[PDB]
Every structure is written in C-alpha cells, then in structure tokens.
Amino acid sequence: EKPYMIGANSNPNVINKSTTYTTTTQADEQDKPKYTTRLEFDTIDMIR
Amino acid sequence: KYENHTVTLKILMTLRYVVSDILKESRYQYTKFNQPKSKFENLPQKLLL
Amino acid sequence: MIYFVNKDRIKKGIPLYYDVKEITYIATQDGTVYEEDYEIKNNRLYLNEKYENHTVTLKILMTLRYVVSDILKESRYQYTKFNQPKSKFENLPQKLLL
Amino acid sequence: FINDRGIKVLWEEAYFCPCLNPDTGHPRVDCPRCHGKGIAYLPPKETIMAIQSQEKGTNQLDIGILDTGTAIGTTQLEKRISYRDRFTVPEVLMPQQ
Amino acid sequence: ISLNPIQDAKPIDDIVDIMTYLKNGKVLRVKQDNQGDILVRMSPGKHKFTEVSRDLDKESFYYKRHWVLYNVSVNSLITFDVYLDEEYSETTKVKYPKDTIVEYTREDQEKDVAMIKEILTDNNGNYFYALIGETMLFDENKLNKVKD
Amino acid sequence: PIQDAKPIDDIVDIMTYLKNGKVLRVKQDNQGDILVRMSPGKHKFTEVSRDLDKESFYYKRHWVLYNVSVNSLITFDVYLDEEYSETTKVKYPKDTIVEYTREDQEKDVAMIKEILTDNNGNYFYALIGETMLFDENKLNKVKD
C-alpha cells in the first residue's frame, strides 16, 4: 500500500577489525564445490 | 615339486612416496574481497617426494 | 661492534674498527648510556671513569664506500660523425666491478 | 605495493650482548637478554614484509636431523636492516615432530 | 503496542537427540568452522544414507533444495554446534542473544553486568532486552557486551 | 579497607609524575606486567622494563627505548612502582565476574565492587547493585 522508500542506513561503525585465522581441528569437513567446465587431453589424438 | 629350484616373478605394485623435503613451503594471501573481514589463507605447498 | 674497556683504553680512547657518521644505540652491563658520558674525536671514543672494567657495544651508521677490484667491458667506442665538422672519437661508459 | 603483497611480521634489531666474556670473546650460557646465543635483541617493531622461495631444507647427519633453508624477503622503503636481524611470523605455523 | 517474544534457536548438545532426530528424518543445520553452514539429512526410502545440501534457505515452492550423498562424521557433529532447520533463521540475528551476560548502565551511574533472560520485539523491529533484577526493558544502544 | 591498590585516574597526573621521573607500573591482559620510565639527560624519551622486582645489589633493572602508546596508559591501569602491593590474599580479584543470589532467592550475576576485611582476617565482598556484604562462600566464581 504505502510507497516503498529507501530510508536510512543501519550499518554501525566498526574499528580495529582483526583477521580471521582458520582453526586447526581433527574433525571432518566438506569441501565446498564449484561446478564448471573441465579441461582434458584428446588422448585418442595423442595415440594418433 | 620345486624344493631346490629357482623362481622368478614379474610383479606389479602400488606407487608410493615419502616427503624428503618441503620446498617453497608457504605462500600466503590476505583475502579481503567479498568477505566480512580480512581472512588468511595458506596457498599450496610444493613437496619433493 | 663491541669493545672491552680497561684502565689503559679509558684515557687513550677506544680505536674504532669502522668509521663514524652517527651512533644509533650504546649499551653496557649497567644498561644504556647517555650523551653526557661519552664523546668521539677523530674517530675514537672516550668514556668516563664509571666504566673502567665494563663492556661497551654500539650500533653504528657509516658511509658506503667501494674500491675498483676489476675493470670489466673496459672500453666501448664510437666514431661520432653526424652533425660534426669532422670525425670525433668518444669513449663510452666503462663497467666497474666494485 | 609492498603493504599489499607483504605479510605482517615483527622486526627486532640485533646487537651483541654485554654479557660476552671479555677474554675468550664468547658468551654466557644463560642470561635474560640472550639465551646462550651471543647476540641480544631490541624491542620488536611491527612491519609488513614480502617473503619468497621459503625452503625447509633437511640435512640428515650423524649428529641428527637439522632444519635449515633459504627464504628471500623484500622490505619497505627507508628501512635499513642489519646482519643477523630477527623476524617472526605469528600467523604462519610450522609442524614439527 | 508490540510483538510477542521470539524464541532463540536452541543449540543441541546431546548427540543422542541429534541422532534420534536424524533417524526421524528431520533436517539438521551444521555450522562448520572452516567452510560455512550446511544442511544434513537422512535419505528417504530403503537405501538409507546421509545427504548434504548447501541450498542454505528454508524450502520454498520456487526454491527446492538439492541433496548430495556425504559421509558425515560423528566428530563433526560433536565438535560443531547443530540446529534444527525449522528454527535457525534470519528472522532475529540479535546482537545480544539470550543467556548472554551484558553490561548495562543503571540510573545511579554505576555499570552492572546482568544476563539477558528474555528478548522481544516491537513494531519497528527493535530488540527489547529483559535483565534479571529489573522490570524496565532496555534498548540496543544502551547495552554493551564484555568478552573474555 | 585495604591499602593494596591506589590506581591513577587521570592521564594528566600520569604525565606529571613522569615529568618528575618516578617509575610507573602498567598492567596487561594475559601478559607480563610492565614498568615504564622517562629517560634522563638531554634527550627525553620513554623507556620500559620487563623486570618488576626492586633494585638491589643482586638485582638490577634493564631499560630500553620503546614507542609507548597513550592508548595503553589511558586504558590500562597504572600505579606508582614504589607503592604497589604484590597481592591481596583473597579468593576473587577485583573486577571479576561473579554469581550470587538476591534477597528474594533469585540468582543474579555481577562483578565485585569492593574487597574488604575485618580485623580477624575474615573477608567480605560487595557486588554491583548490592549494598550489603557477601561471604566468600556465598559468592561463586563464574567461568569464562
């Protein structure tokens, strides 16, 4: 009903942000994938 | 039957390796783009097997 | 560098192995040393009697220096003639191994 | 460029400890400033430095195994490093057994 | 003139209840430290096996989650906090969750630390905080957190 | 009361004492204590020492230059070195997270507001938001 307006910003200020270090752990994980094109040799043509 | 005979074999075995040195051992990046905050990532080691 | 002090070196003045431009940091067993206690003249160092048998160490800055230990690709030449009344000979840069 | 490609590192300068024996010219086995090594160190200075070619070269000998290798670094401007200066990289951890 | 209190997503600590829910087939969400947040599920039908999906949102008619077989580890469950996917949501990522000890300024200009026992919201989406020993509900700006 | 602590509030007083040349003690977080000092002589600059014990014939302090940050001084607690007390033998330190029960048998958390003792050595503690005193047993040390 009411018009949709941007309004004001909400992000607060942050100071002295420290880096993230990957934590060592013996526990298992799952490796986040990327699905995309694969490159391969033309082994048949290599035989030729 | 082969008590005092000789025997010879042609055999297939799995490939195996051990790390005899670690080379160009650490490579680093402060990845910051498209992250909430700076992150440290260890890039690939090279091994001399 | 580091030097060991004795009752004789205190009066003569410590002979320095290097030259001097300015001193970064001095120290001894009793701690650091201030400008009020040491002086340098003619590239040798004097100390007051408080450090008769103490050790002294210094971090020092000195001018860069070199000597020519070989001359390499020693001569390169050009008969420059363009835009000259007559042919002229010019010696191009030497390379030095310092 | 250097601040971009580098890694945060603590730079502490080196200087001979006063504890050196005045006659033999060799250091005390244990003292607060230097733990047997004949060279003491100043307070650290936070610094960004680039590092390359890092090598964990292992030599196996009768005395035992020994870790020694070459790592090539490149500093910022206006910094005048000296021989046997010391650096430590808290971020990077190394496995040993 | 407000909205009723909003429940926080209770983490599950006991492995037994986690396994029971999984056997029932209810979805689980695992906060992996290294590689983000993932969903975990038991395959339907006779061929039982665990499945993972990174389609990290509530299921919707226009957004159907895809499940990949994975060999989920017990240690992963134990060391990583796990939540029921029916609860864990973007609805309220409150800066000061329930049972958190926070520092609040009292009227006598003396800073005190109290544990948040109840949190609710209002029309504007604000976060009203209830602290033990006091009836008036504080606001986000007034409070402060003390860590370690 | 106990005379084991006399923290400085204003940084201006800290600088005034540094001008006078008196040594200071500056605490740290999960880290060793520090002593700070102003160098004598012509050149004035801050100096620090990792040692803490009093100077003696068998023990001498070591001083070196350091670019001390005013942030540390203003934030961290500061004392006069000569008048500092090593420890007050109490179970709970000042400004420590603690748990207790209110007058209506309701459990509540707080930090220690004051550390007190009687003439017989019995220690009483006052918490924030609680005027009354609490026994050592009645308190509980909250785990981080």
Ligand SMILES: [Zn+2]
């Ligand atoms: Zn030494």
